[PDB]
Write an enzyme that holds these catalytic residues in place. Structure first.
Site, PDB file in Angstrom:
ATOM      1  CB  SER A  19     -12.004-100.871 -16.510  1.00 19.94           C
ATOM      2  OG  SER A  19     -12.994-101.278 -17.439  1.00 19.94           O
ATOM      3  CB  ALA A  77     -17.222 -94.337 -23.393  1.00 26.17           C
ATOM      4  CE1 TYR A 130     -24.562 -96.394 -23.536  1.00 26.62           C
ATOM      5  CE2 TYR A 130     -22.796 -97.872 -22.884  1.00 26.62           C
ATOM      6  CZ  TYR A 130     -23.754 -96.932 -22.557  1.00 26.62           C
ATOM      7  OH  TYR A 130     -23.917 -96.521 -21.252  1.00 26.62           O
ATOM      8  N   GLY A 145     -11.907-101.358 -12.427  1.00 22.16           N
ATOM      9  CA  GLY A 145     -12.744-100.184 -12.535  1.00 22.16           C
ATOM     10  C   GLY A 145     -12.971 -99.506 -11.201  1.00 22.16           C
ATOM     11  NE  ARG A 146     -18.092-101.464  -9.837  1.00 24.25           N
ATOM     12  CZ  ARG A 146     -19.046-102.380  -9.725  1.00 24.25           C
ATOM     13  NH1 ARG A 146     -20.225-102.090  -9.202  1.00 24.25           N
ATOM     14  NH2 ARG A 146     -18.810-103.616 -10.152  1.00 24.25           N
TER      15      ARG A 146
END
Ligand SMILES: Cc1cc2nc3c(=O)[nH]c(=O)nc-3n(C[C@H](O)[C@H](O)[C@H](O)COP(=O)(O)O)c2cc1C
Ligand SMILES: Cc1cc2nc3c(=O)[nH]c(=O)nc-3n(C[C@H](O)[C@H](O)[C@H](O)COP(=O)(O)O)c2cc1C
Ligand SMILES: Cc1cc2nc3c(=O)[nH]c(=O)nc-3n(C[C@H](O)[C@H](O)[C@H](O)COP(=O)(O)O)c2cc1C
Ligand SMILES: Cc1cc2nc3c(=O)[nH]c(=O)nc-3n(C[C@H](O)[C@H](O)[C@H](O)COP(=O)(O)O)c2cc1C
Lengths: 349, 349, 349, 349
Positions: free
Chosen positions: B22, B58, B177, B318-319
């Site tokens: 991710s 990003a 965002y 992700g993490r």
């Protein structure tokens, strides 16, 4: 925030979490089907282990419906003392006691799995005169009196189960046993009102469900376990299961326990973690009937995830509770939930 | 048979498994947005770790669209040598390189998280003049020329990404965002064509998706990441996500990456393993658009189960890859799948 | 209080914890023995993974002392730029850089393990004209000038390593390679001063250790790795290791890295977790020389326990870091120790 | 090759593996000290769980020697039926039954830990008139008749234990209870032949060990559990333990169970995995007395490693078996050992 350890309302009950012990034959009853010391150690251990619900193993509603000569039975009032002590000890250890009522059908009369599992040559019954596999006895196709007899046995088994203190009844309609074999066209080739069409094949199974529902008060959940697919070409499929589940829902069935397979042997089963969860998922979301998920669920995060996704209301655990009976207590901590453990054990958590 | 490690056909690509890294901001670029030695170690490590796809963090399509002064950027041809080397090293280590194009909107211009994360007072832009929270600058509401400028910046960002060798493009339309803030009514109170109704709030986000789709060839997947809900009363909900998803599907978006939250701060988020999987499940089953599941997925059995359930086509991690970059290699073995590891490492498996 | 993550004073250094990456051949150098992109990714990954010390793989002090044609080498000033960059990147990622100087002896000149591992027929050298196994070349027995040449090559290798920025030097005297083969009577049947008795078989290995100690300043630890036993009948035993250890201690060796085996093939090795820990335990307690334990150490509790027992001062990890390079970071948390992780990763811990 | 699951010869017995259940008070006996349903579920569960030996919790040899009013007792022939059924069920479940004989001394008469654990004001006895802590009763210092009475109680408790079918007896000489408090100078300030010097402080404890050894045949192991250190300044130290262990060895004691602490409260204990293993290690290697290791052992690899290192002969597990009673069965598989599991459970392994 862990759904796995959030109470679940079913019928008139509140289970303290979403973990249930799947029914698992222990083949340790007496030849009369009586509870022994084995079950009185086996089941309370898992109750202390933290499941909110224990579904006691397939319990035969008549001697001919047993898998092995050492199955639990409920065909006689003399089963009530042992069964009642079993439910009492489960409840005393903190879990709601339930029981699976069963009839092995054309797969009745086999040796214990660790003693060969070979057929014993019983006068087994089924929908049609087709043996399960090589060496199995040819089932005697049931007539309308025979089906009524077995239906009444399921009814009396339920009444006996409730007298014994069980608060959840599951009807074993899966794995190629009697009622599962009526549903599937691999084993049901009847030409009367109970075979052929989907409506006909569901007829006797739905009669049993209706009859048992009538003697189980609405406050006590009635489960039905099914093989959502038989994995066989042209056999029972998920769409059939959805049609069957809609009819069970209208009868008042509280939850569909979604298993698979067992109707015949030589079929490829795509074994994987959660491989039967899509069946519980489809039933729950397309029919609106609560579902229990089962099949290679071994991990707290995995169980929580399928609940988050709406694939099931109840997570049933089988083999992981054979090798790790206290999994629920340690699963809570793994999910950030203070486990409710016996005071004698608090220093171990 | 482990769906997690079965290839995934997306557009013209074949991802070797259903695991993806991710997008995860590293706050380690230069002040000009350049790739540094940190990224060149960070990302190839995870490609060797076995994910079939890496979504690079990003990457801001304009300086004012950055979160931090150390974000990756793609607004200049000067970014191409570093981004091209990043994609080459990711691919050299066995994974398909992808990148998330982003614009931070009203949350732009904050310090690195381990350096206080406080706003820097940039002339940030947004749908409506509403600050994200206490101490944040009031966004300057975009006009139609301003949105067209940012849309073109997304288009040029995508073209640049493709020249650099990236083969999957994700548009960051989540987490409060810029484009996320247009979608949510908690951040978008415009009274013109781009706020108010759902169609109006989807208008600018969909224009960007269509403009980028036009310059990304069909063989290369276009992803969109969205907050499937903002968790706020009367805010963006799953039903809105489904409507948004149907429009993305018609435009030719390949997959919806289903996250949540980030639009405002003071909302209760029910964190738990797989807590965002229901959003990927609903989109996939009720719209027919492929989805990526993400959010507290840490276990091979959990990831395999949600695929078996049909809740998603792609599992994003992700993490767990921050602390365990080789998770996919060891996850294969845990699922009975011979891992395809670098020959230098075979003796460790 | 977790000894595993308590600093270790060795020579003039302070290692930030008691975890080290054991030397592990990668077979990825150029044909000239140069560091490549593989090493520059492989090793820094593990330094970020949290080990306090990285021992770079066996690096040959002369071309004929290589295992494979793709071994790291240190026989030329041309090796310095690549080795210096390797040490810089290891240190930049938080770990102390170290390196194992090696000479493969009679096992020199074999193909890469995943390319058949067959001998290449080099003019290999050894203590006695005895091939390692069927198909291996017969070693040319070294004369006194030949041993002095290799000793000087070890000295120049150490000087080069120090110029490159390495701060721990280990001498590979284990696993049936040159100096190991002098120690073991299964490979050394010499009748001159360097075979026969234990003192004779230790003579050349000790000469090398002393010569290298002289050029390695006291602040920088000198390690020696040995096969504490060869597992062969009448072969090198633990009692011999203790005698060898007492001599190394008197010479000023800082730590004995206790491995086993590799001298001959057809021996039964009783593999099990910690199966070589008794050798590090005996040396440490009965000789008073610090020791490194290695061999199937895969768990934080196991590594902490052997330190609490006083069996070793340093825990070396090999294969677990091939499949789990960030093991030390997650091991700290498992022992109740706040991990010191890169700021980019704090949100994953 | 896994020492943890290799038989252990002790006395005349062969334990089937090296795993024992550490004694753990359950505070679930009747006020008469009788075995209840709790112990008959608690202990057989761990026996099925795979330990070769179960040491039943501290069992008081006289009512005044109990910790709580709900401790098991063995001061009366009426304890024999319950104790005999307990050992029978342990043995039937596959484990050797043992029992710890105890006398709480100056720490006698406290509430259950989950009911405050506060003192009850009993007429407690001890070596010297020093209370354990604030609010504890002042112990009445024993005279030579009192010590003889308690010695005879230990002797009769052992005889009763053997009549009940227990095959291992452990004398509880640790944790600040009666005999432990005679050893330590923090609690023993006597001025007669039973305090002051090391020889004097060991006098009464060694009399008990000798007396019990005489009534336990050589074929049945006699354990002694001790606090190898009291962690107090100027208190009982490891060197004292070694001196004590040498005397126990000469009396015929089979194994020293090495715990620590408990003599007084306000002392810092360096808690860590394996933190008491160095005590079992020193005793075993410097005295030659078999040892049991205990204290934060939770992992198969950790247990196997301390056995490989010679730190102990027996691994005792406490709290891990409260939360994971089947740990031994799954530990075997983790070590590559086919687990011997009940046939009813083979499908779960
Ligand atoms: C020993 C054993 C006995 C079982 N007995 C039953 C049973 O009596 N009735 C039933 O519906 N399923 C039975 N099952 C199937 C399990 O209940 C469960 O549906 C299946 O094993 C998948 O769950 P699991 O992977 O968690 O074990 C049994 C399984 C095992 C291994
Ligand atoms: C340090 C960090 C940086 C992140 N950066 C991004 C990002 O740039 N874009 C994005 O869409 N999500 C980002 N996320 C969210 C993750 O990609 C992921 O969706 C979320 O952490 C939940 O997944 P997980 O539980 O596996 O970590 C970031 C998360 C972290 C912890
Ligand atoms: C691929 C590989 C390469 C190795 N290379 C070396 C080496 O160059 N020098 C050495 O002394 N040991 C070498 N070893 C042995 C390891 O360093 C370590 O001592 C052994 O693998 C046992 O530790 P472990 O169980 O943690 O892997 C190597 C092991 C492997 C698997
Ligand atoms: C609830 C509980 C009861 C215990 N009871 C005893 C006991 O009666 N006698 C004894 O010597 N140790 C007793 N202990 C200490 C344990 O036996 C063991 O020595 C200690 O807890 C460390 O082992 P562990 O980390 O595996 O739990 C008890 C520990 C606990 C947590």
């Amino acid at each position: 925030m862990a759904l796995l350890f959030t109470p679940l309302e079913l019928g008139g009950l509140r289970l303290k979490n979403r973990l249930a012990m799947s029914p698992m034959c222990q083949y340790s009853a007496t030849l009369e089907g009586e509870v022994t010391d084995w079950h009185l150690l086996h089941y309370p251990t898992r109750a202390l282990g933290g499941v909110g619900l224990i579904l006691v193993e397939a319990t035969a509603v008549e001697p001919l419906g047993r898998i092995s000569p050492y199955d639990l039975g409920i065909w006689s009032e003399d089963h009530l003392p042992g069964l009642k002590e079993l439910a009492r000890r489960i409840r005393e250890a903190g879990a709601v006691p339930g029981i699976q009522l069963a009839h092995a059908g054309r797969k009745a009369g086999t040796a214990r799995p660790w003693e060969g599992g070979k057929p014993l040559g019983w006068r087994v019954v089924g929908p049609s005169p087709i043996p399960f596999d090589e060496g199995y006895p040819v089932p005697e196709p049931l007539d309308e009196a025979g089906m009524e007899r077995i239906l009444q046995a399921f009814v009396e088994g339920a009444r006996r189960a409730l007298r014994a203190g069980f608060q959840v009844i599951e009807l074993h309609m899966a794995h190629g046993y009697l009622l599962s074999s009526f549903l599937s066209p691999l084993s049901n080739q009847r030409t009367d009102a109970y075979g052929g069409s989907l409506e006909n094949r569901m007829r006797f199974p739905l009669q049993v469900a209706q009859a048992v529902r009538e003697v189980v008060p609405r406050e006590l959940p009635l489960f039905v376990r099914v093989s959502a697919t038989d994995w066989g070409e042209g056999g029972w499929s998920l769409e059939d299961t959805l049609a069957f589940a809609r009819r069970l829902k209208e009868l008042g069935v509280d939850l569909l326990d979604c298993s698979s397979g067992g109707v015949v042997l030589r079929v490829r089963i795509p074994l994987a973690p959660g491989f039967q969860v899509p069946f519980a998922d489809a039933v729950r979301k397309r029919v609106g009937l609560r579902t229990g998920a089962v099949g290679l669920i071994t991990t707290p995060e995995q169980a929580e995830t399928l609940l988050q996704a709406g694939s099931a209301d109840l997570v049933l655990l089988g083999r992981v509770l054979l090798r790790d009976p206290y999994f629920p207590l340690r699963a809570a901590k793994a999910l950030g939930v203070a486990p409710e453990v016996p005071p004698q054990y608090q220093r171990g958590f």
